[PDB]
């Protein structure tokens, strides 16, 4: 990384529907998000 | 008939009529062949005449290869003109034949008919030629 000319990068918390909060570095300024359909919630990924 | 689909240079020097052929000097396709014995520009006109002669003689059946291809253009300046004012435009296509070159080849069951057809082609041709065979 040269300088801050790239979008700011910081840790983020995603609270998915299943409750499995993931901690992942992302450029979301706020640092927190929620998703109604995650890996553990999707039919195909869960086993449908 | 036999005309190049394209020549890189339309106007070319007269092909040199020197030396015995280095390549195509043996029957390699058919049973019999017409081997040249003198230098000549075998025009596409002559090739067509000889090929039709052979095919019509051998009638139905047989196969005829035409090894040479009249790809060398020879120009002809317009009729009744004085020397100069640039080279004439291409007028007839020839194949530079040299002695020992096999011009035509024939595969036909009957040796009699094959030799007769090749002799007729030799008659249509503008030089001495002999009916050579593959069997050496």
């Amino acid at each position: 990384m040269k300088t801050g000319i790239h979008p700011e990068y910081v840790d983020t918390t995603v609270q998915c529907g299943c409750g499995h909060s993931f901690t992942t570095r992302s450029t979301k300024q706020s640092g927190t998000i929620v998703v109604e359909v995650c890996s553990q919630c999707h039919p195909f990924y869960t086993g449908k | 008939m036999l005309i190049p689909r394209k020549v890189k240079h339309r106007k070319q020097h007269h092909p040199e009529q020197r030396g015995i052929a280095s390549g195509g000097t043996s029957v390699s396709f058919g049973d019999y062949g017409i081997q040249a014995l003198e230098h000549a520009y075998i025009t596409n006109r002559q090739i067509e005449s000889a090929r039709i002669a052979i095919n019509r003689h051998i009638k139905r059946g047989g196969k005829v290869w035409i090894n040479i291809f009249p790809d060398r253009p020879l120009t002809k300046k317009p009729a009744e003109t004085r020397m100069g004012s640039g080279k004439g435009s291409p007028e007839w296509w020839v194949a530079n034949v040299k002695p020992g070159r096999v011009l035509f080849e024939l595969s036909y069951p009957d040796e009699k008919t094959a030799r007769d057809a090749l002799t007729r082609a030799i008659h249509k041709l503008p030089i001495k030629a002999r009916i050579v065979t593959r069997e050496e």
Partner: protein
């Protein structure tokens, strides 16, 4: 099976070159070069008549017993420079045939 190695007299050439080869062909002797596993090539003058007879008898592929000054050496013709016009054998290449080797 096998093919009898056709007998053919050969002489080592006292003079090799263009003039010598043309003189030989006039004399009726075809020049040939014997080479192969023998390491050292030898330059020979076969008899044109006899060699053409051998060739037209046993095809281009035939085994020749070359008598080189009275030395039976088995060879085969691997190349036959034939003049396209005169049709005469112009030159021969003779691959020494080791009695007990494949080619």
């Amino acid at each position: 099976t096998a093919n009898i190695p056709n007998k053919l007299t050969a002489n080592v050439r006292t003079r090799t070159g263009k003039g010598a080869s043309r003189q030989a062909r006039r004399d009726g002797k075809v020049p040939a070069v014997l080479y192969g596993h023998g390491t050292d090539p030898q330059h020979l003058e076969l008899n044109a008549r006899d060699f053409a007879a051998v060739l037209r008898s046993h095809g281009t592929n035939a085994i020749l017993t070359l008598d080189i000054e009275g030395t039976e050496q088995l060879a085969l013709t691997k190349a036959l420079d034939v003049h396209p016009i005169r049709r005469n054998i112009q030159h021969a290449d003779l691959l020494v045939v080791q009695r007990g080797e494949k080619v």
